[PDB]
Amino acid sequence: MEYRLKAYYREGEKPSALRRAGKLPGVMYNRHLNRKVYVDLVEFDKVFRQASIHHVIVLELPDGQSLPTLVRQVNLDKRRRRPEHVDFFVLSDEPVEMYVPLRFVGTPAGVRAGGVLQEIHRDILVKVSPRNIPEFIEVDVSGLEIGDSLHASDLKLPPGVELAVSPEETIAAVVPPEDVEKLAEEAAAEVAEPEVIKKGKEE
Amino acid sequence: RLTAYERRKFRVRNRIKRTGRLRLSVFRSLKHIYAQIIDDEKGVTLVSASSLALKLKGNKTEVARQVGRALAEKALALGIKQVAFDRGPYKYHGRVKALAEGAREGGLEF
Amino acid sequence: PLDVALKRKYYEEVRPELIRRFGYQNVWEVPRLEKVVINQGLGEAKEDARILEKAAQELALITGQKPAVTRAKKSISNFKLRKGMPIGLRVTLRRDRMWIFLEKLLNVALPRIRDFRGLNPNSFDGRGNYNLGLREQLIFPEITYDMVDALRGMDIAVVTTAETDEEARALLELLGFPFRK
Amino acid sequence: ARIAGVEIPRNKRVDVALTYIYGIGKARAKEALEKTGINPATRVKDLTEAEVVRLREYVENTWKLEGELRAEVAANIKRLMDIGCYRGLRHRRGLPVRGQRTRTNARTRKGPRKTV
Amino acid sequence: ASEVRIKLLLECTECKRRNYATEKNKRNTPNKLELRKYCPWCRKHTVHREVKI
Amino acid sequence: MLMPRRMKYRKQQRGRLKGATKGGDYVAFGDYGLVALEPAWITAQQIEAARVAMVRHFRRGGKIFIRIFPDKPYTKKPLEVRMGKGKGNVEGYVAVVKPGRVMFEVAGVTEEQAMEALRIAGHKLPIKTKIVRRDAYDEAQ
Amino acid sequence: MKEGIHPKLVPARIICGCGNVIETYSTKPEIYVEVCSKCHPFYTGQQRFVDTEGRVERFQRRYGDSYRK
RNA sequence: UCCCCCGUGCCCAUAGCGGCGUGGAACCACCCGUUCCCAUUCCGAACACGGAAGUGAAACGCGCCAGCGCCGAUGGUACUGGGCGGGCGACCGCCUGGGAGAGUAGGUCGGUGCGGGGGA
RNA sequence: CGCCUCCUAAAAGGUAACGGAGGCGCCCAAAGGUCCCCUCAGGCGGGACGGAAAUCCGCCGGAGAGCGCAAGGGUAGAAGG
RNA sequence: CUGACUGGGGCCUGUAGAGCACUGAUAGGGCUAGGGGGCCCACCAGCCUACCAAACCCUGUCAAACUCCGAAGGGUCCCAG
Numbered sequence A: 001m002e003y004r005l006k007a008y009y010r011e012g013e014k015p016s017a018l019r020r021a022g023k024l025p026g027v028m029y030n031r032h033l034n035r036k037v038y039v040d041l042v043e044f045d046k047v048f049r050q051a052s053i054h055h056v057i058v059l060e061l062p063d064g065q066s067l068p069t070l071v072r073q074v075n076l077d078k079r080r081r082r083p084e085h086v087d088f089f090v091l092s093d094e095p096v097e098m099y100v101p102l103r104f105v106g107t108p109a110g111v112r113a114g115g116v117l118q119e120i121h122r123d124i125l126v127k128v129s130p131r132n133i134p135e136f137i138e139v140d141v142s143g144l145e146i147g148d149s150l151h152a153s154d155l156k157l158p159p160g161v162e163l164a165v166s167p168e169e170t171i172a173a174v175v176p177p178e179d180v181e182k183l184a185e186e187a188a189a190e191v192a193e194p195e196v197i198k199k200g201k202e203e
Numbered sequence B: 001r002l003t004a005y006e007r008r009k010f011r012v013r014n015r016i017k018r019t020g021r022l023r024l025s026v027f028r029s030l031k032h033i034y035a036q037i038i039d040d041e042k043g044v045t046l047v048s049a050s051s052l053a054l055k056l057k058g059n060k061t062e063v064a065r066q067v068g069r070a071l072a073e074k075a076l077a078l079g080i081k082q083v084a085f086d087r088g089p090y091k092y093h094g095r096v097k098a099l100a101e102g103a104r105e106g107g108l109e110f
Numbered sequence C: 001p002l003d004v005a006l007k008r009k010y011y012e013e014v015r016p017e018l019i020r021r022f023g024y025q026n027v028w029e030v031p032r033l034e035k036v037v038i039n040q041g042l043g044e045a046k047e048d049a050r051i052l053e054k055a056a057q058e059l060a061l062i063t064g065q066k067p068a069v070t071r072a073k074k075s076i077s078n079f080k081l082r083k084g085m086p087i088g089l090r091v092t093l094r095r096d097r098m099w100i101f102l103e104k105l106l107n108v109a110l111p112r113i114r115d116f117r118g119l120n121p122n123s124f125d126g127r128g129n130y131n132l133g134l135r136e137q138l139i140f141p142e143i144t145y146d147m148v149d150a151l152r153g154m155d156i157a158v159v160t161t162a163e164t165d166e167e168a169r170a171l172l173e174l175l176g177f178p179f180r181k
Numbered sequence D: 001a002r003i004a005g006v007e008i009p010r011n012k013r014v015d016v017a018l019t020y021i022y023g024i025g026k027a028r029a030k031e032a033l034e035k036t037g038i039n040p041a042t043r044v045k046d047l048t049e050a051e052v053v054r055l056r057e058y059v060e061n062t063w064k065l066e067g068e069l070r071a072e073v074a075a076n077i078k079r080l081m082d083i084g085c086y087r088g089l090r091h092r093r094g095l096p097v098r099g100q101r102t103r104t105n106a107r108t109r110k111g112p113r114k115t116v
Numbered sequence E: 001a002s003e004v005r006i007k008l009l010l011e012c013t014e015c016k017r018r019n020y021a022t023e024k025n026k027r028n029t030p031n032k033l034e035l036r037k038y039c040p041w042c043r044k045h046t047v048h049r050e051v052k053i
Numbered sequence F: 001m002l003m004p005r006r007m008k009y010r011k012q013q014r015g016r017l018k019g020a021t022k023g024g025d026y027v028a029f030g031d032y033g034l035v036a037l038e039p040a041w042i043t044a045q046q047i048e049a050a051r052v053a054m055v056r057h058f059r060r061g062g063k064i065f066i067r068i069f070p071d072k073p074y075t076k077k078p079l080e081v082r083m084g085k086g087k088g089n090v091e092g093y094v095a096v097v098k099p100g101r102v103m104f105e106v107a108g109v110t111e112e113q114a115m116e117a118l119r120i121a122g123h124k125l126p127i128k129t130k131i132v133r134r135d136a137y138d139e140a141q
Numbered sequence G: 001m002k003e004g005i006h007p008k009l010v011p012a013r014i015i016c017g018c019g020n021v022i023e024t025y026s027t028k029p030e031i032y033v034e035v036c037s038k039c040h041p042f043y044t045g046q047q048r049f050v051d052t053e054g055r056v057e058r059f060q061r062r063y064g065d066s067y068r069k
Numbered sequence H: 001u002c003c004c005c006c007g008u009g010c011c012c013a014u015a016g017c018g019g020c021g022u023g024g025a026a027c028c029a030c031c032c033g034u035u036c037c038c039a040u041u042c043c044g045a046a047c048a049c050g051g052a053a054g055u056g057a058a059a060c061g062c063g064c065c066a067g068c069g070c071c072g073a074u075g076g077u078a079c080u081g082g083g084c085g086g087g088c089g090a091c092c093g094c095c096u097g098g099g100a101g102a103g104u105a106g107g108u109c110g111g112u113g114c115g116g117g118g119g120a
Numbered sequence I: 001c002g003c004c005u006c007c008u009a010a011a012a013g014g015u016a017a018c019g020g021a022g023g024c025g026c027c028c029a030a031a032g033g034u035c036c037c038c039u040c041a042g043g044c045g046g047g048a049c050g051g052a053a054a055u056c057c058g059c060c061g062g063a064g065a066g067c068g069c070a071a072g073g074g075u076a077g078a079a080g081g
Numbered sequence J: 001c002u003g004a005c006u007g008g009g010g011c012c013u014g015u016a017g018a019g020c021a022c023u024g025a026u027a028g029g030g031c032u033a034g035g036g037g038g039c040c041c042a043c044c045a046g047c048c049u050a051c052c053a054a055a056c057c058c059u060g061u062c063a064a065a066c067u068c069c070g071a072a073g074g075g076u077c078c079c080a081g
């Protein structure tokens, strides 16, 4: 979909003051503009948990302007697991690199056999027109056993969208599951002591 | 990847420029020979001479020698006397050597 | 530059067929021979009798050129090898002696090889050069059974200006190199 | 590598020398020197060069020798070992081939005795 | 210095005075060192020869 | 259980434990994570008890990701000796863990399965913990 | 070339057994060889020195058809 | 003073790798030779000399391209001089001044000094 | 138990513990002076005996080789050959 | 009048933090020599692996004796209080 988010301008307000008033600080940029912004945290969080660098967010500004952006970067407070700053990338008419959600259709035969589908990439990096952004990219994984894998070279891309990663990059795999029957093997598995790399006259 | 040519040139010339004298640089093409006296502190050439610019005759070795005399005569009229010879990538031999001998005959001190 | 039949065959016959087979637009683009490097990795003379001068007297008769000593890079215990030890001969043939050697090589030497069935078509550099080894040195017309003492072969590198294996296959085959496949 | 690729001994008679070739025995030595009219008692050191290539020519063109003979004998042992017949099995194991007893002897085919 | 790497003196062969002390490896260099050196008595260069220290 | 196969040095100084975790603060592999809420040296024994507790709750199925590794040698002098006479002997290995670090992630399993396995695992560790689920914030990292 | 180290190359005859003679260069002015490219069976087409055999076995027997049909 | 080339410096990859294209009148190179100077642990490959039929194929120079490499903000954060608080501790905060690294936007297929030859 | 190298050492210098790791008590007549020349390890392909690795050839390869010996600094525009 | 301390200016530095380009460590996946095992075989090859796994790549990390980076400060000289 196409989400909307009120944004506001900030000059010399201190980020800790804005964040204490419930406002997430941010920035807007492309080759033409660079402006210090802030959004409302609860408002931004409602949108971002859905939009999430994948779908377009339109920023309604206080001067009346509206600008179509991709979230380019989210900085998290490593202690509290909270966003502390956003980068809004203002889209132009030229193509753009971006991540399109991968969507894994079907149940693998390995998963039926007891396995686990490891979704290695959940989106994929890609150049596409900002008027061409597909909602997702379907991938058939129903023929993967334990342990087969899928790569970006197996992506059936919609029209207008070019792969921006190496075709040899792994996107999914189906791996063996955890098994209690292996525990007693691993428990009674003696692992020898670490070797210390020879130093000096002995090497 | 430097060539043996570029290594030879750098090696010869670093040693020359360490002594702080004006260098007599010499470029030897298949056809012609050239000379500049260079102040490396200013990065500036003070006096030149070459077969191409004097439209000189046939035998490359005697041509080289005459180029040296020519360089000397113009050098002394500017006050230049002492100098350091910059064989660059060439052996001190033949055409280069002749140009050096020709410079010395003209009173360049080296 | 001497008049040698192989060199003349290169210019008169070989070059025209190469220009026609590949359509070169510059005369310097047509494949030619750069050098022929002969190597004896003797090593059976390391310490024993470093009187490989026997072999140097041989290669000098074969090529008209005095080969030069190869010395061991590092020391190798299993090969019984001390760094710096003399372990063979390399002689680099260019211009008329290169032609003069290759001339006798194709006419006389290769035919005298035991159970000869043609040069190995797959021995090409991947960049347009070729290599072949020899099992003996009596193969050559100058080295007679009388003068010989031991059976010493060699490596032969044939370096061309061709950028690809196909152009080099063309040039060598045209000069008279007998390939089996 | 005179004839034929084997540098046959000088000092010895021609019939005797040519036996030092894979494929030429006492029988074919008589055949080569008659068919080229060479005294069979002449030492190899005394063959006129005309005689040599005369002797060389007939020998190499008439009979399979050295490598071609050896490749052929091998090719026959190979095909016997591929078509899986009984003689082929005996060549597969290195055992004798012409029906001999193996409880004892057969040391030529088996090699020197292996202890137990 | 050791048993095989000995100390030694260099003696000016013209005036016989010992002008330099040095060392060598008498296994590697069993012959007596002959070297040109300045002799300050003769006030010129001179063949000096190894002499026991 | 986990420990380096080789090392350049047998014994490490103790260092400090200040600050939030350096990296590894977002869910990178599985669907749910167990986040450290306070610093500690987590022992190789503790990680293995945490891993076994999750394997046993899953019985058969699922995938566990262990995102910390005990590479720091832990040293203790022999009992009843005095101070001095050199550094103690290596008795074990620990992983340094600071607040915000995602220690374990699980995948291939229901939400109720993951919540409960990460809870039992957390009871084996010498620190308070949080259970998290992969977010858009995790994906944008 | 350096002096006094290289064997001098002079014009040379090479006489093969097949009468072929090559005008080349060598350290020896006249050499006799037993074979050359002009007569070697690999060179001179499919000159099968002897075994122009074909199959040869395992059917050119045909001794005979006397068994019935 | 403008454009091309040859020397020779400076900045120190925004200057590099790769791909493609282009240049021989001039210059440069390959080139033609190995008598002469000089030269090869063998080799005129190199070094060197004497040349001038050819070719810009190689090299070099000059363009174009952002796949790699190189450079890289703004914003925010870590950390912190100095000043204060809190916690039994491991450790955690506030003020004031300073402020990265990673990453994002983006930049880059160089710029410039001196002399020499040619051109307009 | 003297001496050298690194760390501890809190970005000048210095800095302790029966703190963490290694080395020295030699050597070289060239392994020294100077002049001239040369450039590595490694990867791939090719080559008789010949091999993971001997010697040869081609392409890639800025320094990961080398520098008598510990470690560190330095270093091919050489301190290496 | 040169001092502690302070202003400005230059130069020196490798810590905090961070990073992974070097030296090592490292979980998983991919790719993939070599082993384990399984069909098939001895006639020398061939296929298969939910096995261990080098190199390489991706994702994600660790380091007093790691550093492609790198502060705050500190040191020192000049002029001024």
Ligand SMILES: NC(=[NH2+])NCCC[C@H](N)C(=O)O
Residues within 6 Å of the ligand: H080, H081, H093
């Ligand atoms: N220059 C400074 N403000 N330094 C503050 C040091 C950190 C301090 N202990 C804090 O977390 O608050």
Ligand SMILES: [Mg+2]
Residues within 6 Å of the ligand: A045
């Ligand atoms: Mg919230």
Ligand SMILES: [Mg+2]
Residues within 6 Å of the ligand: A200, A201, I069
């Ligand atoms: Mg040592």
Ligand SMILES: [Mg+2]
Residues within 6 Å of the ligand: C027, C028
């Ligand atoms: Mg030509």
Ligand SMILES: [Mg+2]
Residues within 6 Å of the ligand: C121, C122, C123, C124, C125, C126
């Ligand atoms: Mg090939």
Ligand SMILES: [Mg+2]
Residues within 6 Å of the ligand: C127, C128, C129, C159, C160, C161, C162, C163
């Ligand atoms: Mg080639």
Ligand SMILES: [Mg+2]
Residues within 6 Å of the ligand: C138, C139, C140, C141, C142, C143, C144
């Ligand atoms: Mg012969």
Ligand SMILES: [Mg+2]
Residues within 6 Å of the ligand: D018, D019, D020, D021, D022, D023, D024, D025
């Ligand atoms: Mg016989």
Ligand SMILES: [Mg+2]
Residues within 6 Å of the ligand: D098, D099, D100, D101
């Ligand atoms: Mg019987």
Ligand SMILES: [Mg+2]
Residues within 6 Å of the ligand: D099, D100, D101, D102
């Ligand atoms: Mg029987």
Ligand SMILES: [Mg+2]
Residues within 6 Å of the ligand: F013, F014, F015
């Ligand atoms: Mg401590």
Ligand SMILES: [Mg+2]
Residues within 6 Å of the ligand: F041
């Ligand atoms: Mg503990």
Ligand SMILES: [Mg+2]
Residues within 6 Å of the ligand: F074, F075, F076
């Ligand atoms: Mg402890």
Ligand SMILES: [Mg+2]
Residues within 6 Å of the ligand: F083, F084, F085, F086, F087, F088
């Ligand atoms: Mg202690």
Ligand SMILES: [Mg+2]
Residues within 6 Å of the ligand: F075, F076, F077, F087, F088, F089
């Ligand atoms: Mg202890």
Ligand SMILES: [Mg+2]
Residues within 6 Å of the ligand: F043, F044, F074, F091, F092, F093
């Ligand atoms: Mg422990």
